[PDB]
């Protein structure tokens, strides 16, 4: 890889200047090198992997959402032909993605997930997992559909079981893992009443948890919570 | 879409 | 080239698709291969061409001024070395910011300039010119950063020759032109004099012309010369 | 920074 030669320390200290410079993209090449390294990461590594490729993930969905919805309107009643050229290009786009997501997912298993002893490492990178296949999952139409999506299940489950009996409810990777876990019930399992009573019942057992909190703990749980609480907005 | 982290 | 053998029409359509994705790379690709086809680019197709490259450098030098921060913070009395890396990063985004001036301005002398006769094709193709050089200039610092100066400086003189000769002083070509050779003035040949004596009689000339336009073409000056106000409000 | 098109 092109990453090879470069010092682990090094390719750290440019994911955090590529982040600095929004360059995306760069973040997660020097990320994946790091990864690539062999050794486990730190919390604060964890983070700019996960960081660097939601970012390019989430660029190329947004992307793929625009093309998609051009393309379902060329197949409408009344809309003249313009050829395979719409097709084409959300196909180029989705291609690029699904490889993003492969990319991601052959780190989780060679070998981060296997090295993860400690439960908020191993929640994490399941919830990664998990993340990246729903990513996978939105986009496909054939033969492995199903296949993807309860691959995205198994690795939100198993990140689940760990969490509920490892971390506090308020544990803002518990909280993140559930929020996303909600999300995969309500847009690709077709499971809106699952989605929101994990919101619900997620977001009741932290409320009782935070004054266990300090002040800083406090924020970072709160700020979690009102996405459930935005999300539980949205779907009643 | 819904909020995701 | 990689789009040798997408047909022209669908290079152009691509890029349209590209533009409302957000995929500014994409659609400079897109518009490379559509040139390099070798016929003479419509109007609507040289904006095409241009917002792609706009764009794509434009966040390159955003990338670039982050970097270049970092770099002359860490040189600094009292800062702590770190060792090359601020140095390699901020040297690649350049070089890559290079390489796409380069592309540009290579599309442009191979053979885009030399076959537009028209002066609104002419003139918009050399402040390109000028505006790729200017890219370059911003981020020289060796034997040819006056040579590289001299470039965007001749490159914009030819333009304004032509378009002071040829075309309304409402023209927004005309006005866009004189907006970036002022900057170039100010930013780039340290000459805030000339900056602003050329805003603002660019600005003084052009409210002389609105009253000959429509109110299509009234908007379309107007935005321009309120962007040359802002600049002049900045200056002084 | 100033105003470019
Ligand atoms: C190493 C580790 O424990 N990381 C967990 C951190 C990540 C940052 N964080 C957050 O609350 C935000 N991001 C986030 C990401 C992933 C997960 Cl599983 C939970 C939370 C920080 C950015 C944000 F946009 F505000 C969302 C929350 C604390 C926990
Ligand atoms: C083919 C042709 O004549 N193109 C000139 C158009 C380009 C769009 N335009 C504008 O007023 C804006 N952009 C622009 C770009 C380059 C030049 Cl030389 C002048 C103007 C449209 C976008 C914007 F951001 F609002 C700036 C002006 C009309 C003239
Ligand atoms: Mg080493
Ligand atoms: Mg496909
Ligand atoms: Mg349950
Ligand atoms: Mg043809
Ligand atoms: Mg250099
Ligand atoms: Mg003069």
Redesign the interface.
Same mark, same amino acid.
């Given at each position: 890889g092109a990453m090879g030669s470069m010092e682990r320390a090094?390719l750290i200290?440019?994911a955090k +200047? #590529?982040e600095? #410079?929004?360059?995306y993209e760069?973040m997660a090449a020097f990320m994946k090198g790091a990864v690539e390294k062999g050794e486990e990461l730190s919390c604060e590594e964890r983070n700019l992997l996960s960081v660097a490729y939601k970012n390019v993930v989430g /660029?190329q969905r #947004? #992307?793929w959402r &625009? %093309?998609s919805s051009?393309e379902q309107k060329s197949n409408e009643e009344g809309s003249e032909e313009? /050829?395979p @050229?719409?097709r084409? $290009?959300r196909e180029? &786009?989705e291609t690029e993605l699904q490889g993003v997501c492969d990319t991601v997912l052959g780190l989780l298993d060679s070998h981060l997930i296997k090295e993860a002893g400690d439960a908020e490492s191993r929640v994490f990178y399941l919830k990664m997992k998990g993340?990246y296949y729903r990513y996978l999952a939105e986009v496909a139409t054939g033969d492995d559909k199903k296949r993807i999506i309860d691959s995205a299940r198994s690795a939100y489950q198993e990140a689940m079981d760990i969490s509920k009996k490892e971390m506090p409810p308020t544990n803002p990777i518990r909280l /993140?893992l559930a +929020?996303?876990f909600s999300?995969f019930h $309500? @847009?690709i399992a077709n499971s809106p009443e699952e989605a929101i009573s994990l919101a619900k019942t997620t977001f009741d057992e932290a409320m009782a948890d935070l004054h266990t909190l300090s002040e800083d703990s406090y924020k970072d749980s709160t700020l979690?919570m009102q %996405?459930l609480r935005?999300?539980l907005t +949205?779907?009643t | 879409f819904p909020a995701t982290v």
């Open positions: 090094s200290q440019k +200047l #590529a600095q #410079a929004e360059r760069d /660029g #947004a #992307a &625009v %093309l051009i313009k /050829g @050229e719409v084409e $290009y180029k &786009v993340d /993140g +929020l996303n999300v $309500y @847009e979690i %996405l935005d999300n +949205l779907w | -």
